[PDB]
Amino acid sequence: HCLPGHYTPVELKPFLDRPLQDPNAPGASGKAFKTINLNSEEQKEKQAGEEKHCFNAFASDRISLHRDLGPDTRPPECIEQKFKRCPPLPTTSIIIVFHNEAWSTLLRTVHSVMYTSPAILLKEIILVDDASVDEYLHDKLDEYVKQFQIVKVVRQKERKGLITARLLGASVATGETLTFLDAHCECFYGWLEPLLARIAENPVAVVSPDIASIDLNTFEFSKPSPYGHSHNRGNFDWSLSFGWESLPKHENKRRKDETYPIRTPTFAGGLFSISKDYFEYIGSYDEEMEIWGGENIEMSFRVWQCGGQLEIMPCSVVGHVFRSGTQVITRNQVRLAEVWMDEYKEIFYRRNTEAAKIVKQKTFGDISKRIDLRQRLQCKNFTWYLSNVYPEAYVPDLNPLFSGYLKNIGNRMCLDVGENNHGGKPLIMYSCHGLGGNQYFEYSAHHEIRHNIQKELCLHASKGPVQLRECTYKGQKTFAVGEEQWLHQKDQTLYNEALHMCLTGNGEHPSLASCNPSDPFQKWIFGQN
Amino acid sequence: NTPIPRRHTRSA
Ligand SMILES: O=c1ccn([C@@H]2O[C@H](COP(=O)(O)OP(=O)(O)O)[C@@H](O)[C@H]2O)c(=O)[nH]1
Ligand SMILES: *[C@@H]1O[C@H](CO)[C@@H](O)[C@H](O)[C@H]1NC(C)=O
Ligand SMILES: *[C@H]1O[C@H](CO)[C@H](O)[C@H](O)[C@H]1NC(C)=O
Ligand SMILES: [Mn+2]
């Protein structure tokens, strides 16, 4: 079953030929649809759509389910890439989980897949209904989908979330590989072959496309650039949030051109392909995780520690409509920390008070099956992960000198880094929540007040609003500069030695003021959670 | 009062 040479373009022709498109139609070729100066009914429809789907459904509903994305703008080595017939390209089962998805967005996803995926690879499209209410997602969907012959709806009767839905999808799939997509995606030209070719070469590779943005207001598709605009890897922070970071120099050097995988410490986890056999062998998903949140970080750690490769294939591009309770997500994160993170789980627990509580109350469930998996696969430990996969990571102290919150006596609020503070921004005063996160601060042996969830940031004294800056102390040669050294004095003042001034919690932004221990706005409690 | 940021994946 193993033929010589490379697949021909005709061998890889798609499952369905895209009908000719109207270049001046709304959102043609992936262009912006500006929905502006609407009649009175029209503004009510758009507003309704926005509240139901958290994207401009008014726009989606006026854009073709068949829209092309214009010329192929990938790097030339992606466009010219040829694939060996031995080992053969494996078949794939597409698995899409949906819950109350717009019709326009779900069926544009399914049409996109059929117009872009080689017929010889596309075994089936499995749509897993996670207990949708919308009636059009019941019999109308079932009947509409029959014409495509390979599309099947699987009904999860009660809402159990993405994890359970994906495992149900995988249990009925007959493809050699599984390809997970969300229900609001558009495939670019050539997206599937690079994922399936990489699994063919390396059966322990878990491979993700480069995920392009579809704009939630205009549905503009951010097209790839032919230079390959400097790529991102996935990471995590010590709140166990998924994030994106630049490639290190060593990875830029290894990748001779864009057909080379990007090795990624973590994956976003919405869009990826895996050998169906490897998905089973590596322990699928932790069945005791509820709804969703954390499963992509858990699977990242498990794949790396248990001997697989987590890769982004930049020749593979899929667009996704990016958008924008806590107990379920925190419990999922505690279960992954308890199984994979060894002694480093305490770094996470100190930053997420709800997680520390779930651990102390032992409400995270039995993990014996995931511990047995880790033992049976002889997985490496989290020290090995950090040394070998993510040697660039900032790793906080396992046992920091001190951590907690900084509560102001004057206004009874907490010092707070605010949203999206990666340095260079002032701080705010915010209601004390006791949750850690944006109110988490550590005290160091060098008298620094660190906020160290993603970057190592230091409270940095200035004439204006105090700021967070990247700490100057980071190893043996370096020093903590005066602006980043603080004394918590017997009068409860936070004193900067360099500027001879005290932090005040008055005004919009905490600032330095002449030291006045009578001023309750200058009195701070460095409390423990 | 805000949660520990997540709910939808962020883009690059
Ligand atoms: O209760 C739920 C909530 C979400 N999803 C699905 O899980 C995927 C991820 O959710 P969403 O797109 O909102 O997450 P994001 O992509 O923004 O991270 C989508 O295919 C959703 O339809 C689900 O099956 N059940
Ligand atoms: C983790 O494995 C490394 C080698 O990869 C070893 O040096 C270290 O002692 C192990 N850690 C623990 C806590 O066993
Ligand atoms: C959520 O964001 C608000 C500001 O919008 C505060 O920074 C608050 O501290 C945050 N909550 C947590 C738990 O970090
Ligand atoms: Mn999504």
Query: SS3 letters for A362-416?
Result: CCCCCCHHHHHHHHHCCCCCHHHHHHHCCCCCCCCCCCCCEEEEEEECCCCCEEE
> Among all chains, which residue has been given the structure tokens 């089973």?
A280
Q: Chain B contact for A241, CB < 8 A?
A: yes
Residue A51: CB atoms within 10 Å: 9
> What is the sign, positive or negative, of the torsion defined by CA atoms of A429, A434, A437, A439?
positive
Distance CA A71, CA B12 (A): 23
Distance CA A243, CA A467 (A): 23
* Tokens encoding A414: 């907490």
> Residue A89's Cα: distance from chain center in Å?
28
Strand-strand pairing, A122-130 and A92-98: parallel
Minimal Cα–Cα distance from B12 to chain A, Å? 6
Strand-strand pairing, A309-321 and A185-187: antiparallel
C-beta atoms of B1 and A232 within 8 A:
no
Please say whether the beta carbons of A330 and A358 come within 8 A.
yes
Please say whether the beta carbons of A393 and A400 come within 8 A.
no
Buried b (16+ CB within 10 A) or exposed e, A244-276: bbebeeebeeebeebbebbbbbbbbbbbbbbbb
C-beta atoms of B10 and A243 within 8 A:
yes
Please say whether the beta carbons of A450 and A471 come within 8 A.
yes
Check the annotation: does A438 bind a ligand. yes
Please say whether the beta carbons of A464 and A511 come within 8 A.
yes
Distance CA A150, CA A152 (A): 7
Helices A139-146 & A103-116, crossing angle to 10 degrees?
Answer: 20
Distance CA A269, CA A401 (A): 35
> Among all chains, which residue has been given the structure tokens 């270049």?
A23
DSSP 3-state of A180: strand
* A3, burial (CB in 10 Å: exposed 0-12, middle 13-18, buried 19+): exposed
Under 8 Å CB-to-CB from A460, ≥6 apart: which residues?
Answer: A466, A467, A468, A469, A483, A484
Distance CA A45, CA A49 (A): 6
> Residue A436's Cα: distance from chain center in Å?
21
CB pairs under 8 A between A and B: 46
Phi-psi domain of A342 (left: phi exceeds 0; alpha: psi -120 through 50; beta: other): left
* A62, burial (CB in 10 Å: exposed 0-12, middle 13-18, buried 19+): middle
Phi-psi domain of A187 (left: phi exceeds 0; alpha: psi -120 through 50; beta: other): beta
Please say whether the beta carbons of A24 and A32 come within 8 A.
no
Strand-strand pairing, A177-181 and A272-275: antiparallel
Distance CA A425, CA A445 (A): 25
> Across the strands, what pairs with A187?
A318
Distance CA A211, CA A423 (A): 27
DSSP 3-state of A316: strand
Give Cα separations from A104 to A145, A170, A341, A517 (angstroms).
Answer: 14, 25, 41, 63
Distance CA A91, CA A111 (A): 18
Residue A439: name the closest of A424, A421, A425 by CA.
A421
Structure determination technique employed: X-ray
Based on C-alpha coordinates, what's the Rg of chain B? Answer: 9
* Tokens encoding A468: 């967070």
Q: Which amino acid is at A483?
A: E
Chain A residues within an 8 Å CB radius of B3: 325-326, 435, 437
Q: Which long-range contacts (CB under 8 A, 24 or more apart) does A276-281 make?
A: A276/A93, A276/A170, A276/A173, A276/A175, A276/A176, A276/A177, A276/A178, A277/A176, A277/A203, A278/A203, A278/A204, A278/A206, A278/A308, A279/A170, A279/A178, A280/A170
* Tokens encoding A57: 């459904």
Please say whether the beta carbons of A177 and A276 come within 8 A.
yes
Q: Which amino acid is at A21?
A: Q
Please say whether the beta carbons of A108 and A60 come within 8 A.
yes
Number of H helices and E strands in chain A, helices first, is 15, 23
Strand-strand pairing, A92-98 and A177-181: parallel
Number of H helices and E strands in chain B, helices first, is 0, 0
Please say whether the beta carbons of A267 and A313 come within 8 A.
no
Check the annotation: does A182 bind a ligand. yes
Ligand 2 nearest-atom number relative to CA A342: 13
The Cβ-side half-sphere exposure at A261, using a 13 Å CA radius, reads 18
* Tokens encoding A488: 């918590």
C-beta atoms of B4 and A436 within 8 A:
yes
* Tokens encoding A361: 């109350």
Q: Which amino acid is at A192?
A: L
Check the annotation: does A488 bind a ligand. no
CA of A269 to the centre of ligand 3 (A): 25
Give Cα separations from A420 to A224, A424, A425, A426, A427 (angstroms).
Answer: 26, 11, 9, 11, 11
Q: What angle do CA A174, A206, A90 make, to 5 degrees?
A: 40
Q: Which amino acid is at A131?
A: A
Please say whether the beta carbons of A137 and A96 come within 8 A.
no
Q: Which amino acid is at A282?
A: I
C-beta atoms of A324 and B8 within 8 A:
yes
Please say whether the beta carbons of A204 and A306 come within 8 A.
no
* Tokens encoding A424: 């260079």
Helices A368-376 & A295-305, crossing angle to 10 degrees?
Answer: 30
> Among all chains, which residue has been given the structure tokens 């039995």?
A366
